[model samples]
Target: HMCDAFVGTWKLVSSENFDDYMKELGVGFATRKVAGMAKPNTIISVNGDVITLKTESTFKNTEISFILGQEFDEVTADDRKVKSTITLDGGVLVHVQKWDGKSTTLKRKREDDKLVLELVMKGVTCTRVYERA
Candidate 1:
């Protein structure tokens, strides 16, 4: 499956413009400060048709399990409960989170040995690169 390429442990290697992205998401200053300082590891696993993405960090840990093309309830890293969906768009994994009539999308793709995360909210874009662990 296309998601196979993403089923591995990935460690954050670089992040750019994430604070602004958090701000666009309406995260408070205190939370953004802690979030900006934490380096997290992502673990992706699959069980049958369900894919689970787990993020681990000293500041906070979060996980989500969803089947492709199905909508599920999600509690975001910043603690917002939203409707979420994950789908495979060619080689990219597109994740959309909807809450309060607003929505955000996160695109995850594999480039060489790196896993790139692209987050867009409103007009702010944040790019975080990860390496297979």
Candidate 2:
């Protein structure tokens, strides 16, 4: 279950190709620079049948709660309103979002003691690694 593997607070430890990924998503240069510099903590929690995922950083904080496989409206960190759905496939959490006919996929998986996130948009991909708090 996603809860067993992801219900914990995680601190970002490393990020790769994030700037390019943001650029591909149409984030402005200033915003991308600031967003790229901030390392946010991810908190995953489950209550009843709903799951909540939160990202907190010095620049901004975003929170979303939803049931698995249900589409929900989401205002992204860069302020894009999108339809987002998250599903747990085995040990991996697959999140997909669509906005203005464009889409992105984010896969979250646990590796060793770290939580690894893979974000993909078009042909650009970014990887962020997090450690247990």
Candidate 3:
């Protein structure tokens, strides 16, 4: 039931306090420059326990799918590989992707007027808050 609410298109709104968040992930200066300039796109769909997330940009694209509460292997279109798990923590949906000895977890929820997505990788955590478009 919770997953159904997230099965829709979402656009990038505003990223709050991203500098320190990216730095902690060791996303080098060159990468950060490009990341900051480009607006990433994400499409998510849910079918029962199966969930798919597709993230794209002018630079690259990645598609991943997994069952709820289960772990699976994911390969990025850019060639980065990772193991991921998705589960609902309380009422919020949580996703954790681990790669190269580091793990990133994304916690998402929708409030009255907005959608909130929080990303935690390495020691850096950033939140991308959005409104339905």
Candidate 4:
């Protein structure tokens, strides 16, 4: 349902309380501080099993490209060790991230006029909603 609506290029609009989100991912406090202060821009493009996500900010920029339902090794912009797998569940695009002996699941969908993203790390879940720019 939401995955079909998400099959396009989307610009990041805004983030809702992402501090804890970063924290759960083991982001350093200093980096989180800078991340909170900076405006993050994101571009998501999806085509069949191939998905590309580009995240940009004044502090850094990173890009991730992967095929759905396949496992791949990825390095974050901050050089974090991450293994990723993406799949479409029902109408949602779900991603599983394994890093630092921890694993997280990210579920994505579109709500109203915005994109809704939920990140579940350990037991903590963070949600961020975005609108098209």
Candidate 4 clashes between residue pairs 3 or more apart in a chain or in different chains:
1-91
Q: Give the TM-score of candidate 4.
A: 0.83
Ranking by lDDT: 1, 2, 4, 3
Ranking by TM-score: 1, 2, 4, 3
**Which should have the higher TM-score, number 3 or number 4?**
4
TM-score, predicted candidate 2 vs. hidden true structure: 0.97
Q: Mind giving the per-residue lDDT tens digits that candidate 4 earns over 1-133?
A: 2245775545556566578878877789899899877766667876766788777879999888888888989887656788999887776889888887888787888787777888776667777766676
On the 0 to 100 scale, the lDDT of residue 82 in model 2 is 97
Candidate 2, 7-113: lDDT as tens digits: 89999999999999999999999998899999899999998779999999999999999999999999998999999999988789999999999999999999999
Candidate 2 at residue 133, lDDT? Answer: 84
Q: Higher-lDDT candidate among 1 and 2?
A: 1
Task: Compare the candidates by TM-score and give the number of the best one.
Answer: 1
Which model, 3 or 4, shows the larger lDDT? 4
**Model 4: lDDT to the true structure:** 0.76
TM-score of 1: 0.98
The top-ranked prediction according to lDDT is 1
Encode model 1's per-residue lDDT on 1-133: one tens digit a residue.
6589999999999999999999989999999999998889999999989999999999899999999999999999899899999999889999999999999999999999999999999998999999988
List model 3 lDDT by residue over 3-113, tens digit each. Answer: 777766676788865666677666678777777665666788877767888877787677778887788887744345778888877768888878888777778888766
